[PDB]
Amino acid sequence: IDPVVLQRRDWENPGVTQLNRLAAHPPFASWRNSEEARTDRPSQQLRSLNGEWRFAWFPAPEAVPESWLECDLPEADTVVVPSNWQMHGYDAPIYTNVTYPITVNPPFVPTENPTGCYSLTFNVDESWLQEGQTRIIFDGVNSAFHLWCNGRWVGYGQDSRLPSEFDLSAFLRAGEN
Amino acid sequence: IDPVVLQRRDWENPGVTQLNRLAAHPPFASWRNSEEARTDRPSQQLRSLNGEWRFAWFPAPEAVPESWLECDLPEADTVVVPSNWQMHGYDAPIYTNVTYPITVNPPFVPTENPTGCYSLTFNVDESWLQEGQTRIIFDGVNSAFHLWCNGRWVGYGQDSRLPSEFDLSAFLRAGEN
Ligand SMILES: [Mg+2]
Ligand SMILES: [Mg+2]
């Protein structure tokens, strides 16, 4: 995968902690019924994309083949999301206390940078696209990520412990995405 | 010019105020003689690049031809630097008090964005490149700029009223640059 994304190396620049990320806010559900809001019941406007996803491990972002942007890699596995890929055995989890698990050379990280390629094919109803705004919410991604929707680059996010949100309204189509 | 530079539009993103810019610091001259430092005499290690530069005006960054990176544009004039290009008559200076001179739509600016293409051919001695670090210092560039050296992209800067500095050690060659 290329070109601006690999050349710009946003994950080695503390001046770039996000690209195209929406403003942070308190928890939303966008109820269209007041009584459902009052009683804190599920909202039709808030969908979980949790469940079975496609996943492939790579030793570095340079190793990621371009075709992955367009379609599923045959060598990928089907895995549960949310998950830490170390818990599925793709590489080792590391326990260190104080000493960084990487060479201390800010803002640089090792060239061998384990890379998790997650993908999902899913439906979007036309009602969601005729009007209004459809965003995706990643509550936790460790430690940084680039996002594509239907082959098009959407954005980038950092901070493993807060939600990253991106407007997908111009990226989605009715049916399979 | 292209591809990552025009695609990223760093001049319409308050999250990117510089790329590859060096840390700010008090005025340096790197004297190699202490008596010279004491008397505040000129330093052979601090060279002015003020004087005659080549300049061309464009209505937008998109209209800048790729060739300008590699070689001088025949249509470019020879102008004095430092200068404001309005004072040379290339476009009009604007006096507004409170109301912004552009449509208030942060972080966006008009697609018609007057662009000043400056170039300089200059000598660097081998003594400068065999040892140590050679930086360029721009004390004031209004309002934002990309920098190339011998065709290769160096970095980007904002804030019109403070110096932007860049390491050219790896971009320069002995003789003409
Ligand atoms: Mg970064
Ligand atoms: Mg900017």
From Swiss-Prot, chains A, B:
Reported induction: By allolactose.
Disulfide linkage: none
Record-listed substrate binding positions: N97
Lineage: superkingdom: Bacteria
Subunit structure, as described in the record: Homotetramer.
Family named by the database record: Belongs to the glycosyl hydrolase 2 family.
Name assigned to this protein: Beta-galactosidase
Gene name of the encoded protein: lacZ
